[PDB]
Symmetry: C2
Subunit: 450 residues, 2 copies
Amino acid sequence: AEPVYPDQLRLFSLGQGVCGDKYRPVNREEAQSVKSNIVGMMGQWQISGLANGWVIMGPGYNGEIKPGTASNTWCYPTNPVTGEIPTLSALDIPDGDEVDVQWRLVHDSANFIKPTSYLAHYLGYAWVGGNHSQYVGEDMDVTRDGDGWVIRGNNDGGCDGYRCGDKTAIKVSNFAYNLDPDSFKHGDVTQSDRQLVKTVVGWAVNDSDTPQSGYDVTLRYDTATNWSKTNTYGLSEKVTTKNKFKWPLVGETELSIEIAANQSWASQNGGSTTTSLSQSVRPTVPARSKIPVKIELYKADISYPYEFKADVSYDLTLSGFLRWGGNAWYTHPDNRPNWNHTFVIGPYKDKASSIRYQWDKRYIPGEVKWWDLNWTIQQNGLSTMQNNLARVLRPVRAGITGDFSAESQFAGNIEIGAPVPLALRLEIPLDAQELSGLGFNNVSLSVTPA
Amino acid sequence: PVYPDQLRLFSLGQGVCGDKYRPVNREEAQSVKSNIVGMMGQWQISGLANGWVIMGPGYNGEIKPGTASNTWCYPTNPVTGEIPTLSALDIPDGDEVDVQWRLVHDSANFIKPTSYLAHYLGYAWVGGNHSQYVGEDMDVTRDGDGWVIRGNNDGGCDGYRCGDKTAIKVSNFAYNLDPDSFKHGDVTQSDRQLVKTVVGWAVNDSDTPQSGYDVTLRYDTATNWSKTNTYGLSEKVTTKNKFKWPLVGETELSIEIAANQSWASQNGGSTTTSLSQSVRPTVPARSKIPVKIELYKADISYPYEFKADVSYDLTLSGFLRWGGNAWYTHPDNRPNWNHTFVIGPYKDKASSIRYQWDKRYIPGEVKWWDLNWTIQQNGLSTMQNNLARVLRPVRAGITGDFSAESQFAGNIEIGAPVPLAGLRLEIPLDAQELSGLGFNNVSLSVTPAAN
């Protein structure tokens, strides 16, 4: 309600202080109210407008809010959807075997069993608890189900209530883990150093009576990169990454490691590869003069414990019968029908399985084709639903660890010194054999117009 | 390369961009999906080239065919070769004197890059008499709390005024601890345990069901915590904005770190915060409902680590060369020259290399150094790889041990209604007992939802 929702802001390019159909300019106070969020949605040196001649700058300008004018405007809806589900801080589960990472999440009474149970209960699912308790989400048994788990109330002994024997089950299945490359952190560097294995030197001469410029002196060469990694546990066998990425750089050791996408993290533990590389400068040597040029070749290796975060997602399927005269299905059946509905807890898939969608579009009558979330609100009130939904939708991440080590060869910049006279050709010796013995193959120096 | 910071959303109709801009295509959109989605509303839908669309974070940034009257665009003629943001240059924590010494003497990560910056900008003799190259045979001397990197001047040299070595002064250091870089070791202690269950009843002595009253639980909790600081640098680190101590395990901690205070002067204590749980139950006519409130105790400890970003001022003193320098006026009188940069978060245009470089193509902006001249003198590549080194983020590890104990209540739970043999409450609370277990000023109240 009252509070401004960052994720509902929309930008317009309609001129100063102008908004599109059914949007109004965001004012200073509101902007300040969620400063971090607006800035995080802006470009480096972006500058957008706010109400009554004010402006908010991007991260580059330190997201500052001051008087000003902008052609574009941060606008808010004249009819904003109220009572958003908050997004709680991530629940970080330490690295372990898939089974253990999953037990830790699934049997957590306060962060999983109770919220998901209460969600099912709020949706009108009957008997969401075991007969050892009168409260929902208690005396809940967690049992293995393939690569998933099932959560149903213990059914030992007898129970009171019509069909109390038919306990609703909460199926947690279809798990997935997406390693986030940006979450990269590393411990103390075990090994680290970069030797100067050789330095190529010589000169670059200018013969003509006119200043030689606009030519690129380019060094091309090959070297091998040897890296390897370990995986402390087995969850590794199931994590992938949306897209390929370059292993992050640490120290002064230039590496060229490409982790491949959608390929088991546990299946990519290292490799030896020779990579063609290059370096180049565009000198400007004055008439009939020469410049000293130097290229330092290096060798570096580094080792360290590493850690990434994998975003966990799973399917939440609720199955049981819908309570009589207390139901949230849109048709509000009264025949206590056996029911099955699955929510995708993680990356969006479709409307039917998106709690956040059905919640946010709850006031658009034509969109409610599944759970009538409005019912949960008259039944429980805004705060209770918001707090509960936030708990079931809380992001879950799993740590991914192990040791990393690598060694590679590479050249530094082609450096040049103060030009010397005399009274664009190169005189830079390249000992093929010594270089080859050092691990630098197919090394060449070329001159080519800019 | 599609540079995300040059992207621009326009609201001018189907596939329409602003002047000198063009529609982002499906592929280009995929190459920078996260940056685009990170600028979009939860359920925003925006257009791309040839009738495609990219959706907001809520739809998981799906890229698919669709019609949209607002569009993601890119310059037809983009400012090319933006300075690459390299990975962080980690520095071994220690006492302030250590981190500075380690930074300042780093030949390949600081001396060479800052010396080349001066040289490319036209500063003369940025090198020692014992080398023909820029940035070699340099001497670093103190000058208060600031440092000075300048070519060795001993012996004899050649060149007009070769005795005038350009000095690179580093001063005014500052270290900003980044709360999001949080990480921890083995959580050498943990768990939660139930220490008491406060139970009672809500009764309804009416012939009609009751749903108009909030039962709320209010109380004070004290978190007894602490944290050590392995090294001395922490005496100078601060945080721009306050933050909640990060949640680890399942011990709810109510700890806050204040901005503008030395990291080292916030090592723990007993902090009291007032919490409040509530619920609006529905009690059938002539009925009562059991109310349950569990109270927990929790202990946690573990080594911790946050990184502190290091910023400093880089001042270049020397005279600008004869045949060309970078100053927008391009003097030739071979003048002494003082100019300082701010290596770290923005401050102002004059002292921001990133700013002058990114806006180089805008004539009115070049009021200091024009980096278009340096690019025509050394090539586009040379210059962005050099500025990539100069602006390479530098950070020191801030480590130590963290320990904490706290008491917290679970949510208020409601049982099944059972026929009695404004909503009313009957739940005993013994101030002294509760207090013995770390819960003070505990109250259960029944309030109409209409207040």
